[PDB]
Design a protein around this ligand. Sequence first.
Ligand SMILES: CC1CCN(C(=O)N[C@H](C)c2ccccc2)CC1
Ligand SMILES: CC1CCN(C(=O)N[C@H](C)c2ccccc2)CC1
Lengths: 193, 193
Amino acid sequence: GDDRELAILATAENLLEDRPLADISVDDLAKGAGISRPTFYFYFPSKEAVLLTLLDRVVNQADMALQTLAENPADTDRENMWRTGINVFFETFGSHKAVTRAGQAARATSVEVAELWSTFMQKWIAYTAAVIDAERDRGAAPRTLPAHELATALNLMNERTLFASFAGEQPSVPEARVLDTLVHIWVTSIYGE
Amino acid sequence: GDDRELAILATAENLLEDRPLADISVDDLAKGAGISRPTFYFYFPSKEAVLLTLLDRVVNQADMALQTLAENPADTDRENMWRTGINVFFETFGSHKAVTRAGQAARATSVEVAELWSTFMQKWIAYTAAVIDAERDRGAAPRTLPAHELATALNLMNERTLFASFAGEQPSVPEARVLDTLVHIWVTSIYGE
Ligand SMILES: CC1CCN(C(=O)N[C@H](C)c2ccccc2)CC1
Ligand SMILES: CC1CCN(C(=O)N[C@H](C)c2ccccc2)CC1
């Protein structure tokens, strides 16, 4: 039951490491999961729906990890606070590069993948903005740009820059330098006047 | 000759304002350009090739505008220098939103659109890095991050943030606030310690 479903998900994630969704068949997913094609269709309406679930799981893992941080402050300076938080996204999505890559491409063709991504981006921006506001309220950050607009650009930066590094795009920041690059831009743009 | 070619390009740009490339036919482009379908195929091998040329023209217009700036320094402070340069991209791509939107989507499916975009990104990053280096050499900017890695992230930020604003994505920075948002992040990240 949940075991066949999990096997289909594992197969799909494994197969997306070697080729795109377009080059993967339902027969490929069924075969890999040790089930027939009609049995597959009992668990999922389409290969597209398999990706959506994989992405949903990755996105929620990141979100849950950020919630955990938000509830248990690490005892460090402000630079390290931002780094720790950006690192949740670096590690979570960096641990699922094929799902990241396929899921970002699916945004063009799938309304549900677009809305999933859009919902969580709004959440992570809102949280970023709340932290900047608290930093301004405590007098640690200067009142420069509208917090929510600053939050939006920094989050979009992270999205495009992390994804380019993971995919090895040209151009991209090397994966071993991307965390420090983002953290510097967040800290200088948040604290700087 | 060049007139039929230009008419096909104009038709394609006009039609991309109302619908995507997938929903536009060669018969649509021929009709709009006042030519037959075989005559179309004399000028362009595909509707895809029409987009590639449109994007090529937009990209080169931006590039040429930046070259002009680079050769004639505006007499202002450093904030205004960056703003003027970011503004070339804001205005050029902002004046061709349908071509921008279609061309960015084509990156997934077209190797030539991917390589066009990649070539000019490398150029604009290299130029950004050269300016930061000169700023460091004159002692106006501190030696923080590797210039080229800083240049890469700021350019990727601009790409994703400008495009989200133009497309009205959720989330996005409002188009009337996006220039000031980017300029603040560039200036604080380039000059800040
Ligand atoms: C406290 C903040 C830390 C930094 N954040 C962050 O990088 N979000 C962006 C949008 C992202 C999300 C998933 C994958 C790649 C990038 C948000 C939350
Ligand atoms: C001096 C620099 C100014 C800012 N630049 C810039 O925004 N480039 C990015 C990559 C971009 C290009 C086209 C469309 C949207 C964004 C580069 C050059």
